[PDB]
């Protein structure tokens, strides 16, 4: 079987359509997600045309081996998909209606800079490579693009599944390739963020600041250094929840500024003590009492600096 | 091979039956479980009917390629199943008795809000897609739905394996699909919660409260801050046992309220000290002595608030 | 090829035999072990009988496709085995001697209640499903059941590999199945428990008890609370060695009772201090001095309670 | 099919070309990376030559089985690649144009001595083994060597993909092999190095040095030993980011020297105390005051020693 | 195709040869290593003999399916190898020269008692099972046994790859098997052990001993108990580097004895305090001053006891 010969000089249009049955295994670290879907392809091969009256039937069904079928592939997949052909139907004019169910692991890049208020745009790129006998381009049948309502990705909200209708047609290793962009949009979700990461990290930070209602260098050193251990040990506890990136994220910045407020708290505590033992308990107490409004306010305003920086 | 032609206008009934041989690899995080089972299918194709007298035999056995067999598929599977056909038997009337042994990884959503007293309902969804020549619906042979007695899922109690007999018949990409719901019910199980998570976490919390039988700001700061480290380090130790969810669970709420009781204990300790060094040891001692009934009672009642909130 | 017709009304005996070549990958968590072995099957198909004189040969060798061979399967495997047929030999009477080398991942349940003095019984269950034309039962050729001497499972002692000769014959989805139990016994092994888990955990516990040779509430609070952190951090260190079960184990009980001895030590320390600051240093000292024989003795006797409870 | 016979005594040239479609799964620990690419091969087999006029066609397409095709293999792969032949085209002169899409896991050694300013050179080694009837050598078509612009490796910058045009021709197990070196260059990237590993580790180190503005052996011991715990716990937190190597890295040296500055700080603190309690508070204070310029300066200069050692 | 008939009653010699191309993925825990190599086999099948003059060619090449080829297998592999036949060459006399490239995961037992100065002997065991028609033995072609110079195993030194030429011929399940031992000798390598495990663990241990230049029970308790936490937290940090074995290793013994020196340090500190508060500061100071030479010397000598015990 050859590809269908062209009527004029025109290339062959294949009408694509992905319907998401399941989506699962978004690996935030590997920048992958697994998907289980229908792929529908449709084109016109007039070599397969027939008379519905003389053949007796409205629709002819073939096996994949029997007829010509285009080699459609995914670009951004790890390995080629687990495909199973569901149905091949040819109408009287020669219009082939192909359908397969596939499952593929997909590499779409992720951006965690606004964690845990980030949203993502997952791509599924479909290509077809043209042949020597005829050129092939993809098109999108927008009625055959959708998703099951049961489609769930725990800890995200699946907003929308579409495709960009204009395919990207381009030359590669001396032949025309036609690429299509199918986009799954999603938006994050971590109702427990505040009680699982933020609130206990604010509490351990506030505990360090009770050293501004105290003058014991021995109690203060225990307060500030022991709660710094408590902070690091807590960061250890929530390490699994936080994104491990080579760049700075929003939650990551909050964390960093907290390590800074531990450093500045120690400076104060050391200064307050150096002034009191250096017989200036006037200036010593003036600083420690100022820190009690200075630290919380500077914290709140810097957090507004960050918030506004990222959003 | 086409599907069997209909006698009247009726659709084709396939009689389904899943018998669980093994169940294993419930991944609480990925919301999957692996299963190894028999799938039995049964329908009537009168094109395969024969005379037992003239054929000489009572039952004819075919190969899968030889005869028409419906394309049954699972909905909520990662990849299509590892199927091995066990037996195909056709009786004189044309009744096909199909049997295969499969193993599949399955995506059923899990709800840990009532951890570790949660129960689950694992779904295995069977579909069949109807064809142009004839409509197909699934039915359930409830005598062929069951499970091996050896079937174990460590840390759960396998309660029941059934199917919802009314199939869900619906149109999808222009054809009728017939869906079936097979439900594995399970219920959790963790005797170690009481002896592995709750009791040592109550002990480390109680240790923090011995600061209400003390007036040393230096001993008290060590008591409350060191036991807060002990709490976080313990939470680290039992991190593997606890469910890593984007939502708030019951055990997770207990944990959170404990981080709050550390914060409130520090407030008290700081206030008691601020009053004693501010020459009001009457009010200082009044508070610290009140906390000794206040803290434990508030704890017990809040835990009853939580308990009743979740149950 | 059909199954061999019966001489009388008798069912077909297949003579089984597993010889373990390697065993490896015991996953204590997943309750699996991998195995690499020979499976030998032997039955009589008199349709394959021949005259050694007229055929010219002593033994005829066939290909698997050529002759009838029973569908033997494992029950408690994740996926069906990686089988490679080694030899098929038919003697003049029609006795088929089949041999294959397989490797399979196996689900046998494990019991860690007596960790690290537990022993296990790993099952490999062989089934055969009878057919419409004839009934099939398994038998054990005990000369063809054994294990290579190199067979090693690091951290255990491979005691014995046998089979229970009486097969379990039973009806399943309307046909007779014949099941066989092959048992690999194993017994645990951990000299490092004493020098890796128990001894450093007794040392950190004893360190907490030097607070009975002291009256400083500040040193005592540091001793008991700091060593409790040391205990939890050590439990973290040996978390990989200890079994993560939903039930209580023997080592797990020892651990739990140690968390209790930290709680009781804190009670004492708090009471001793409350009596001394409440001007009763007679009773204060009486208790602290009694704890010095009370604690170690109660520990030793409770450990004998536990020991005897589990053994 | 034999290899094409030589015109003269010359060997057969195959023109190679790898175009990277995706690259992913760089395992820093295992020294692997996965890749998905096109491999293009081109040679002249004049046995396949044809007359475009009499054959009627400009280009003949064959199946892999039909014609002779060289066994090209990768050297440094774990398992042989997942190859799928995309197109085989023969022009009138007998020039075969082969194209396949493969995905392979690759073992290229990595050097982390200059972490996190290291750059890498990933190799993909192509071999062909010559045969008895004729010698085979690889050549590089540099226009067919390239990479997709979407090719991403999170936390690195993909600089360049080329091949060394001079193939390495050599005798192995009595035959000529022709090897080619395809090099993917990459350079590291951890913009957050300073902000997540270095800065909080300098802060916890500086906190230890506030013991030079103090004379309390009890506060100083808490300062230096508690911040040493904070250092180790932080190193635990950033363990995932740091490379696990059997050799010394640059970041690893910084870490090591920090453990040394904790040791030397303790020596000082112990000496300062030993002199003050040994009634020499002149020399005691002289040392502690000197450490306040000595420690930071020695640190800065040693870090310049290291920096210059590695770069 | 049957095996070649014997000329006399002699058995068939197959000449083996493994050439290591790559070696990788030594899993210290699972006692496996992956390997990628050439396997060369050579034997005489006179059924394949030909006249070079009449056939026209000097050497005939066959496909694996075409001719008889022995079932050579590995003993100590997890799954049977990923084999790809590279070349089959038959000379005029019937001498088959087979070559395949395989990759296999291999189970060779490892001994870490002298970690990190241990050396290993990795086995690759080749078997052939004799058949009913003829006996088969393996031989070693020592010119076809070697390794690529690029062969690397990070953190080890690949010393040598040979085979024991005398095959082990033996009866198994009623037939002769011929076994061969191919040995890869490797030796460990960890310069970072001294700068990653031993030195910071000696520093944290030395810090505990500054309590012999001090008489404050409160500072001493903080010194010894806080550095014991620091020791456990550090052991946590280097847990990944250290071998997780059921037996006692050399590095493991060093670790254990360090936990003992923490226990003995606490005993001293408790005794020194009990004597000073029990008004015997003569004996109290005598002990503490003796410990300053006793502890370091006993440490050094015990480490020489260990060193000499293991080596």
From Swiss-Prot, chains A, B, C, D, E:
For this protein, the record's InterPro entries field holds:
GABAA/Glycine_rcpt (IPR006028), Neur_chan_lig-bd (IPR006202), Neur_chan_lig-bd_sf (IPR036734), Neur_channel (IPR006201), Neuro-gated_channel_TM_sf (IPR036719), Neuro_actylchol_rec (IPR038050)
**Which regions span the lipid bilayer?**
190-212, 216-240, 249-277, 281-311
Reported impact of residue 198 to Y: Marked gain of function, with a ten-fold shift of the proton dose-response curve towards lower concentrations
Q: Which residues lie on this side of the membrane: Cytoplasmic?
A: 213-215, 278-280
How is the protein disposed in the membrane? Answer: Multi-pass membrane protein
Look up what happens after changing residue 251 to A.
Answer: Marked gain of function, with a ten-fold shift of the proton dose-response curve towards lower concentrations. Also shows slower apparent rate constants for activation and deactivation
Phenotype upon changing residue 218 to A? Decreases cation selectivity. Decreases the binding affinity of TEA and TBA. Nearly abolishes block by Cd(2+)
Task: Give details on activation and inhibition.
Answer: Tetraethylammonium (TEA) and tetrabutylammonium (TBA) inhibit the proton-activated currents in a dose- and voltage-dependent manner in vitro, whereas the blocker of acid sensing ion channels, amiloride, has no effect. Channel current of GLIC can be inhibited by inhaled and intravenous general anesthetics at and below concentrations used clinically. Ion conduction is also inhibited by lidocaine and by divalent transition metal ions such as cadmium ions.
The subcellular location is: Cell inner membrane
- One family from Pfam that matches here is Neur_chan_LBD
User: What does the UniProt record say this protein does?
Assistant: Cationic channel with similar permeabilities for Na(+) and K(+), that is activated by an increase of the proton concentration on the extracellular side. Displays no permeability for chloride ions. Shows slow kinetics of activation, no desensitization and a single channel conductance of 8 pS. Might contribute to adaptation to external pH change.
Q: Which family does it belong to?
A: Belongs to the ligand-gated ion channel (TC 1.A.9) family.
Output the PANTHER family linked to this UniProt entry.
Answer: NEUROTRANSMITTER GATED ION CHANNEL
What other facts are recorded? The homologous nature of GLIC to eukaryotic nicotinic acetylcholine receptors and other eukaryotic pentameric ligand-gated ion channels, and its sensitivity to general anesthetics, define GLIC as a structural and functional model of signal transduction in the nervous system, also relevant for exploring the molecular basis of anesthetic action.
Under which name does UniProt file this protein?
A: Proton-gated ion channel
- Per the UniProt record, the source organism is Gloeobacter violaceus (strain ATCC 29082 / PCC 7421)
